[model samples]
Target: SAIKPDMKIKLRMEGNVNGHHFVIDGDGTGKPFEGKQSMDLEVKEGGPLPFAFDILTTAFNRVFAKYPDNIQDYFKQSFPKGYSWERSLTFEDGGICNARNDITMEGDTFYNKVRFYGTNFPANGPVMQKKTLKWEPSTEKMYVRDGVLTGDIEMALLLEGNAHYRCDFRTTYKAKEKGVKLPGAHFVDHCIEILSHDKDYNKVKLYEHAVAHSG
Candidate 1:
């Protein structure tokens, strides 16, 4: 497909540990900038899971052609006039995503979307847009350990080869915190992201008991 000069790319990676957002604006030649341009990348600040909203219209519309109360009518009057839709309020938690078919008219359309999300958020959202990323594997066998359990951390945010960002952390048996922060960090995401097995295999920052022996 032909790339349009007015088009840009967006990438956001998150699961249940850390969140990251990337954008690439059209460079001189329509390609994004390369190199240590952290200026275009940012560490997402929120739960690891994605927050999505389901949209619906307040009034009903469904007709074979453009009728008074038909589905297509809503689309036709949406842009120049306006639209009345009902979607979820902006939230801080990851909600389930639902499938939907969006529509628009001449230019009138309304869809529930990420108004603007990311860390270091701008007042009106990022104005000076970013362009692209070529990410590659930086390290896959490193450990971010504390005094307790050895936290095995795998990283791949090298920013090479159209890479967005990624991280796979495997904490030994004594831990588990899914799609929020760091496996039970904050007793939710943060706390667990850095903790290990405490006395008697309890989840905590420090352990006063013995480390489990390998099998």
Candidate 2:
């Protein structure tokens, strides 16, 4: 079957650093991040938020998997210094795939990331890893593999699309997992923006490292 004019498509930013399911009872109030583990649904429609960042242990294991433990320990030494990473899109055959990102150079489109820190940010120090001293990027250049970015240990987003990308929204209501009426298939524009960088589309803004805890 060739490309069809009518088709439903959904693109999700899969793969998480440290994912933990959270839930709550009838009452609605709590810091999802501080939660060790755990929801409601508008009485039937709503998903409680959760801290998505991978814990120190897992983060190092994946981020520095290929590297030696000693090197990994370096970052362990600088635990809380704070650092952030961004993702990019790679274009191929008029198609799109998540470009390798674990980390990259500011020399190109990627920008400053000199220092990230919070006196007691990120859950008010409820987390581990103190300074975030030293971490490493993929040892080798990450390339597109099987329609997705592979190789390299860079931390990048899996949400990738290109000019040729045409898909559907298949909207959902709150947390009911119910589909909505867009009536027809829709194209992925934001995904394309990641690839094109049209009007600095690829340029991602810097975010504060502070995290919400109890407050």
Candidate 3:
């Protein structure tokens, strides 16, 4: 039972609309890291997973002051004052590991793709619309996908004005072994579908969002 490999986990969820505010960062470390978490959300609104489990369980109960401790740091002091976090370990055989973070958008300009999924690696690539990702290491927990497009305007911003769009958000990391059972109770059922285009990429109006989390 000796495969800890410096296990690490980080999380930051944020949301706010109309006034604009979006911050998303779900860090990773079994090796490989460069983290930063942010939030403002016009003071607060919409997303960020219902306050990201009460701010990572109150910053992991004030930095290992109790409960399971090895590496949690909730969000490492609410991150976002300047923003900078880094770590790396690479491969040996336990497979790659990575934790990453970056997102700051205000005033709209469309184009996005951020994907990373896991039970232990599956789809890890497609980072555009503000890039920076290459830190791969994980035992478990990682799911993020965002796709946005607004090209070749017209038809009143593709249909009835207000043509501003942005999306860069993902967070999920559950890895805490030793009979395993308390990775925040573990439960995730996901779905997000939004397809609409007029100038070309057809398939107008199809919005779907699903959720289920037990932790």
Against the true structure, whose lDDT is highest?
Answer: 3
CA error at residue 27 for candidate 3, angstroms: 23
Residue 175 error, candidate 3, Å: 15
Model 3 over residues 112-157: C-alpha lDDT tens digits?
A: 1122111111123111111211111111122222321111101000
Please write out the lDDT profile of model 1 over residues 1-215, one tens digit for every residue.
12121222222222221133322111111121111101122223432222110010111111011122211122222333222222221211222111112222222222221222223212231111221121222221212245222223332222234444333333221111222111111110111111232232112121011111111
Model 3 Cα shift for residue 44 (angstroms): 29
lDDT of each: 0.20, 0.19, 0.22
Candidate 3 residues lying further than 4 Å off, grouped into runs, are 1-101, 104-185, 202-210
Which runs in model 2 stand beyond 4 Å of their true positions?
1-67, 70-78, 95-215
lDDT (Cα, 0-100) at 201 in candidate 2: 15
- How much is the lDDT of residue 170 in candidate 1? 35
- Give residue 107's error in model 1 in angstroms: 47
User: Against the hidden reference, what TM-scores do the models get?
Assistant: 0.17, 0.19, 0.20
In order of listing, the candidates' clash counts read 26, 23, 11
Error of 1 at 3 (Å): 42
